């Protein structure tokens, strides 16, 4: 009865809820249901930006397959984010 996109959104929302429950436990602070839904809606939108950017970045380098340099480019604005993603890339590569 759920459309494809409703099922993706629900899957996203549930994973967001679970990550928030972990944070809530670790930092001793609960989240409202509304906050968790808000973070999910932000995350779904963020993934749209990420996906569109990744496709355009890959194409800008004459590639149809997105690679880990496209992802690094996604992370370019924050030094700690880029470092984190660069480290993880090396990890995967090992």
């Amino acid at each position: 009865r759920f459309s494809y996109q409703q099922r993706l959104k629900a899957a996203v929302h549930y994973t967001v809820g679970c990550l928030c429950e972990e944070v809530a436990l670790d930092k001793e602070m609960q989240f409202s249901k509304q906050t968790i839904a808000a973070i999910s809606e932000l995350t779904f939108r963020q993934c749209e930006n990420f996906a569109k950017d990744l496709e355009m970045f890959a194409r800008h380098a004459k590639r149809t397959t997105i690679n880990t340099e496209d992802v690094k480019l996604l992370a370019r604005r924050s030094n700690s984010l880029l470092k984190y993603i660069t480290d993880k890339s090396e990890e995967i590569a090992q």
């Binding site: 996203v12 609960q30 906050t35 997105i66 924050s78 993603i85």
Partner: protein, 74 residues
């Protein structure tokens, strides 16, 4: 706890403009991590704003206070 790669793959494909576009296996793994970092960043920043106000929980008000600076970081 985190996003399944099966889901992230479909999430990325949902927005691609071109049917030719693919995602490398390593890139997909990285996008799994990046989405989690985003969620956790929003959640912990909302927590800090709640702690600073001695609030009982993170409500939408607290998330909205941290939002412009979160979205500008990503």
């Amino acid at each position: 706890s985190g996003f399944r790669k099966e889901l992230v793959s479909r999430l990325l494909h949902l927005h691609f403009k071109d049917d030719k576009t693919k995602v490398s296996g390593d890139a997909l793994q990285l996008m799994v991590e990046l989405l989690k970092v985003f969620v956790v960043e929003a959640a912990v920043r909302g927590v800090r704003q709640a702690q600073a106000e001695d609030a009982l929980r993170v409500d939408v008000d607290q998330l909205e206070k941290v939002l412009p600076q979160l979205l500008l970081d990503f």
